[PDB]
Amino acid sequence: SRSYSQRYAKWQAKFNAFSNPTVASTILSNVSPVAQQNFQTNVPKFTSVNENVSAVLTQYGITGPNRAIYQGFGLKVARALNRIGSGPALVNMINGLKGYYISAFNANPQVLDAVVNIITGSPTGYVS
Amino acid sequence: SRSYSQRYAKWQAKFNAFSNPTVASTILSNVSPVAQQNFQTNVPKFTSVNENVSAVLTQYGITGPNRAIYQGFGLKVARALNRIGSGPALVNMINGLKGYYISAFNANPQVLDAVVNIITGSPTGYVS
Amino acid sequence: SRSYSQRYAKWQAKFNAFSNPTVASTILSNVSPVAQQNFQTNVPKFTSVNENVSAVLTQYGITGPNRAIYQGFGLKVARALNRIGSGPALVNMINGLKGYYISAFNANPQVLDAVVNIITGSPTGYVS
Amino acid sequence: SRSYSQRYAKWQAKFNAFSNPTVASTILSNVSPVAQQNFQTNVPKFTSVNENVSAVLTQYGITGPNRAIYQGFGLKVARALNRIGSGPALVNMINGLKGYYISAFNANPQVLDAVVNIITGSPTGYVS
Amino acid sequence: SRSYSQRYAKWQAKFNAFSNPTVASTILSNVSPVAQQNFQTNVPKFTSVNENVSAVLTQYGITGPNRAIYQGFGLKVARALNRIGSGPALVNMINGLKGYYISAFNANPQVLDAVVNIITGSPTGYVS
Amino acid sequence: SRSYSQRYAKWQAKFNAFSNPTVASTILSNVSPVAQQNFQTNVPKFTSVNENVSAVLTQYGITGPNRAIYQGFGLKVARALNRIGSGPALVNMINGLKGYYISAFNANPQVLDAVVNIITGSPTGYVS
Amino acid sequence: SRSYSQRYAKWQAKFNAFSNPTVASTILSNVSPVAQQNFQTNVPKFTSVNENVSAVLTQYGITGPNRAIYQGFGLKVARALNRIGSGPALVNMINGLKGYYISAFNANPQVLDAVVNIITGSPTGYVS
Amino acid sequence: SRSYSQRYAKWQAKFNAFSNPTVASTILSNVSPVAQQNFQTNVPKFTSVNENVSAVLTQYGITGPNRAIYQGFGLKVARALNRIGSGPALVNMINGLKGYYISAFNANPQVLDAVVNIITGSPTGYVS
Amino acid sequence: SRSYSQRYAKWQAKFNAFSNPTVASTILSNVSPVAQQNFQTNVPKFTSVNENVSAVLTQYGITGPNRAIYQGFGLKVARALNRIGSGPALVNMINGLKGYYISAFNANPQVLDAVVNIITGSPTGYVS
Amino acid sequence: SRSYSQRYAKWQAKFNAFSNPTVASTILSNVSPVAQQNFQTNVPKFTSVNENVSAVLTQYGITGPNRAIYQGFGLKVARALNRIGSGPALVNMINGLKGYYISAFNANPQVLDAVVNIITGSPTGYVS
Amino acid sequence: SRSYSQRYAKWQAKFNAFSNPTVASTILSNVSPVAQQNFQTNVPKFTSVNENVSAVLTQYGITGPNRAIYQGFGLKVARALNRIGSGPALVNMINGLKGYYISAFNANPQVLDAVVNIITGSPTGYVS
Amino acid sequence: SRSYSQRYAKWQAKFNAFSNPTVASTILSNVSPVAQQNFQTNVPKFTSVNENVSAVLTQYGITGPNRAIYQGFGLKVARALNRIGSGPALVNMINGLKGYYISAFNANPQVLDAVVNIITGSPTGYVS
C-alpha cells in the first residue's frame, strides 16, 4: 500500500544508490556469470522460433512490420509455453492471445494459426 | 522460469553484493528517510490495534500466548483493511480469516468477533 | 539478421562493458535527472489508476491475486491510452484486451467493464 | 509493553546503526556462510513444490494470477509441514488453511485439493 | 525451523559481529537515550513494589532469602499488571502464580496474599 | 538497600561505560571464547527438548502459539532439571510449575503431562 | 561393426590413455564447471522425488529394501518425464513400467499407483 | 557379479590408491567441511538420545554393559526415525526391533518400552 | 538420509579430488589390470549375444533403431541371467521385462520371443 | 561421559589430524599388509555365503531388492556365527534375527529358513 | 573377531605410526585444547573427593596405603556417579563395590560407609 | 599433597612438552622395542582367555553385551592371577570380584563360576 509519492521517493533513492560506481559494479559483476547462464538458457529457445516463424511469414508473403506483428504473437506463445507448459492451461492462454491479436491489432487468424502450427505444431481451441 | 539452481545462484550473488560495506551503506543511507516515513506512517495504525485488542483480551481473561493468537488475528484484520479498504472485499476476507484461526489454531470464535468488533466496530458478514 | 550465436555474443560484450564501474556510473549519472523526469511524468498517471481500480475491486469483493488480475487489465488500458490516445484505436485495443483477459485468464467481463468505466469513464465499443 | 513511539524510537536507532558501512558489513559478512547454509537447506524444498504444483495447475487449465493463488496456498501448506511435521496438527492446519483460501480468496476447493494431493499426497479433513 | 547446529552457528556470527568496537559502540550509543527512557519509565514502578513489599515482609518477620522469595512473587504480580492490566486476565494470572510459589517454593499463602494486598490492594479471585 | 534513583544513577553510569568502543570490545572480546563454551554446553540440551516436545505437540494436534505454550513449559521443566537435578526437589518444582501453567495460561494438563513424559519420562506428583 | 576382440582392444587403448595423469586432469578439469552445472540442474529434481516418495512409503508402512523397490520405480517415472515430457508417451511408458515392477519384482500395484500419484499427481492411463 | 577374487582384487587396488599421501589428503581435505556439516547435523540428535535413555536406565537400576544393551536399542529406534520418519513404517520397524533385542539379547521388554516411551514419547503398536 | 544440497556438496568435493592429476592416475593406474580382468570376463558374454540376436533380427526383417530396441531387450535378458542365473527368478524377471518392452516401447512380442529363444533357448512364462 | 559438543570437538580434531598427508599415509601404509590379512581372512567367508544364498533365492523366484533383503539376513547370520560360534547362543541370536526380519522388513519366514538351511544347514528354534 | 597374532599385528602398526614426530605432534597438538577442556571439566570433581575423603581418613586414624585403599573406593563411587548418576543404579553399584573392597581387599565396611557418607551424603541401600 | 590446580598445572605443562614433535618421537621411538616386548609378553595371555571364555559363553547361550560382562569379569580374574599369583590371596580377590559383578552388574553366578572354571579350573570360595 503506497502512494505514487512513496513509490517515487523510494525509487529515487534506489536509483541513486545503483548509479554509484561501486554499487553498480559490485552488483553487476557479481551477477555477471549468473546472468550469462540465464540468458544462455532461455534465449536460444526464442531465437529458433524467430527463424521458423520468419520462414512461415515469407511463405505467406508477409512483409515489414506486419511480420513483426506475428513475431510478437509467436514469441508470446512461446513465452507462455515456457512459463505454463503444454496442455489445458496453454490452450486457454493461446485462445485468448489469438483473439487478442486478431481484434486488437487486426492480425490475420490464418497467419496466426500458421505461427501456432510451428511453435505448438497444431491449432489451438481444443487440447491436441 | 527459474530452477532452484538458478534461484540460489542469483540470490547468492545479490547477497554478496549487498554485504559490501559501501553497497550496504549506500543503499541503506539513501532509503533511510524514506523508510522512516513509511514506518511512521503505517506502524502507529497497528500499535493502536495492539492496544485496543489487548484491552479486550484482558476483559476476556486471556493470558500468555493465547493473547498472541488473538493479537495476530486482529493485526491481520487491520492489514487487510489497509491494503483493501472497508466494504465487501473486507467482509470476504474476514470470513475466511476467522475460519483460518478458528479451525487451524482453535481460536475461540466469540473472542475473535470481539476483536473484529473493535477494529471494524462490529462483527462482519454485514457491512456496518 | 542475427543468429543466436550473434545475439548472445553482442549481448555479452555490452553487458560486460556496462558492468564497468566507470561506465555504469557515467551513463547512469548522466541519465539520472532525465529518468527522474520521465518517472515523475508518467508514473502518477498509473498510480491514480491503481487507486481507483482498487476502490472498484473492493466494491466488487475482489481479494488477493484476483485484484491483481483486474489491476493488470486496468493498467494495460491506461498504457494504450497514453501511447495511442482516446478514440477509435483505443476502442479497438480495449475490445481485444478484454478478449485476452476474459478467455486467457478467465477474468469476469462484468468487472472488467467496471474497470474500463473508471479509466475511460464508460465501457468501450462506442466512443463516449 | 511499548507504545508505538517507543517502538519507533528504538527501531530508528537500530536502523541507523545498521546503515553504518562498518556495522552492515560486519554483521552481513559474518552471517554470510551461515545464511548460505540456511538458504540452501530450506529453499529447494519449496522449489520442488513449485514445479509439481505448477504442473498440476497446467493440467487444471489455471492461468495467470490464479496460478499464484494456488502457489501461495501450496507453499503455505509446505511451510506448515516443515515447522509442524505430518500428522494430526498438520491436518488441523490444512483444514483451516484450505477454508481460508476458499472463502477469503475464492479459491476453488477442487484445485486446492489437487495441490494438497501433491504435497501431502492425500486430501485433508482426516489423518491419512 | 533450526537445528542446534544452526542455532549456534548464527548466534556465533552475531556475537562476533557485536563484539567489534565500532559495531558495539554504534549500536549502543544509538540506543542509549532510548534505553534511558525505557529504564526510567518502567523501573520506578517496580522499585516502589520492592519498597512496599519489603515493609510487609518486615511486619511478618521475614528475613534473608525468604524475603527474596516474596519479593520475586510481588515483582511478578507487577509485571503481569504492566503487560496485561488489571481485571479478569490478571486474576487468572495471580491464581496460577500463587500456585507456582506456594507449591514449587513452599511460599506461605497467607504472606503471599499480603503481598497481593499491597500491589493490587486486595487478594485476588474477585476484582476489587 | 537502594532507591530507584540510585539504581538508575549507577545503571546509567555503567551503561555509558559499556557503550564505549574500547570498553565494549575489551570485555566482549575477552569473554568471547568463554561465552562460546557456555553456549555450547547448555544450549543443545534444550534444542533436543524442542525437537521431542514439538513432535509430541504434533501428535496432540497442537498448532500455533498453543505449541509455544507447551514449549515454554517444557523448556522451563528442563531448566529446573539442570539447576536442581532429578529427585524430590524437581518433583516439587514441577508440581508447582504444572499447576501454574494450567491455571495461569489455561494449559491443558494432558498435554502438559505429555511434555513431562518426554523430558523426565514420567508424570510428576510423586518421585518416580 | 565390431567383434569382441575389437571392442576390447579399443576400450583398452582408451582406458590406458585416460589413466595418464595429464590426460585425466586435462579432461576432468575442463569439464568440471560443466558437469557441475548439469549435476545441479537435474539432481534436485530427483531428490524431491526421493523425499516425496519416501513420505508415501512411510505412510504405507514400507521398510528396508522394499522402500528401495518403490524408490527405483518412482525415479524411473521421473526420468522418463525429463527425457520425454508429460502426455501420451509418458502414459505409454508408465504402463509398461508398472508391468515391469509388478511382475518382475513383485511390486504392489496399489503402492506403485500411490508413487505415480505424487510424481505425476495422479495414476496414469488417462492424462490429468 | 563379482567373485571373491574380484572383490578383493579391486578392494586392494583402491586401498593402495587411498594410502597415497596426496590422494588421502586431497580427498579428505576436500570433504572436510562437508563431513563436518554432516557430523554436526545428525550427531546431536543421537547424543540427546543417549542422555535421555541413560536417565531412564539409571531410574531402572541398569548398570554396566546392560545399559549399553538398551542404549543400542534406543539408538536404533532413532536411526530408523531419521531414515524413515514417524508413522506406520516406524511402528513396523520397532515391533521387529523389539523382537530382535528381546529374544536375541534377552533384553527386558518392559525396559525396552520405557526407552521407546522417551524417543517416540510412547510405546509403539499404535501411532500416538 | 541426505538432502540434495548434501548430495551435491559431497559429490562436488569428490569430483574435485578425483580431477587432481595425481589422484586420477593413482586410482586409475592401480585399478587398471583389475578393470581389464572385469571387462574381459563379463563383456564377451554380451558380444556373443549381439551376434546371434542381430542375426535373428535380420531374419525378421528388422532394421534401424528397431533392431536396437530388441538388442536392448536381449542384452537386458542376458544381464539378468548373469546376476540371477537360470530358473524361477529369471523367468519372473523375463516375464516382466517382456511385458515392459511390449507396452513401454511397442516392441513386437514375436520378435521378443525370438530374442529370448536365443539367449535362453526357450520362451518364458513357465520354467523350461 | 561426554556431551555431543565434546564428542564433536575431539572428533573434529582427530579428523583434521588424519587428513594431513603425512598422518594419513603414515598410518595407512603401516596398516596396509595388516589390513590385507584381515580382509583376506574374513571376507571370502561371506562371499561363499552370497553365492549359495543367491542360488537359493533364484530357486525361490526372488528378484531385485527382495534378494537383498535375504542377503542381508544371511550375511548377518554368518556374522554371528563368526563372532559367537555355533551352539546355544547362536540359536538364540538367529531366533531373534529371524523374527526381526519377518516383522521389521516383512521378510518371508520360508525363504528365511532356506537361507539358514544353507549357512547352518538346519532351521533354528532349537539347537541341532 | 581377532586372534592374538592379529591383535598384536595391528597394534604394532598403529604404535609405529604414532611414534612418527609429525604424526604424534599433529594429533596431540590438534587435541590439545580439547583434552584441556576435558581434564579441567572432570578432574576437580575427583580432587574434591580426595580432599574430603582424606579428611575422613584422618579422623579414623587411617595412615599409609590404607588411606589409599579407601581413596580408591571413594574415587570409584564418584566415577559411577559421573557415568551413571544418582539413584537406583548407583545404589546397585555401591552395594557391589562395597562387597568388592570389603572382601577382596579386607576394607573396613564401617569406614567405607563413612566414605560414602561424604560423597553421596549418606550410606547407600536407600536413596536419600 | 596437591590441589587440583596444581595437578592440572603440571599436567598441562607435561602434556605440552610431550606434544612437541621431537619430544614425542624421542620418547616413543626409544621405548618402541621395549613396549613391543611388554605387549608381546602379557597380551597373548589374555587373548587365550578370551577364546576359551567366549566358547563357554556360547555354550551358555550368552549373547551381545552380556558376553562382554563375563569377558570383563574373566579378564579381571586373569589380571589378578598375573599380579598376585595363585593361592590364598587370589581366592580372596576372586571372592570379592565375583560378588562385585553379581550385585553391581547383575552378573549370573552360574556363568561367573563357569568363567572361573576356565581360568583357574576350579570354583573359588576356598583354596583348591
UniProtKB/Swiss-Prot annotation, chains A, B, C, D, E, F, G, H, I, J, K, L:
Transmembrane parts of this sequence? none
* Gene3D superfamilies, per database record: 1.20.58.800
Alphabetic keyword roster: DNA-binding, Virion
Q: Which InterPro entries match?
A: Sulfobus_virus_coat_C
**Compartments where found:** Virion
> In the UniProt record, which is one GO cellular component term?
helical viral capsid
> Per its database record, what is this protein's job?
Self-assembles to form a helical, filamentous nucleocapsid. The capsid proteins wrap around the DNA and maintain it in an A-form by non-specific desolvation and specific coordination of the DNA phosphate groups by positively charged residues. This certainly protects the viral DNA under conditions such as the extreme desiccation of its host.
Quaternary structure and interacting proteins, as annotated: Homodimer.
Q: What is this protein called?
A: Major capsid protein
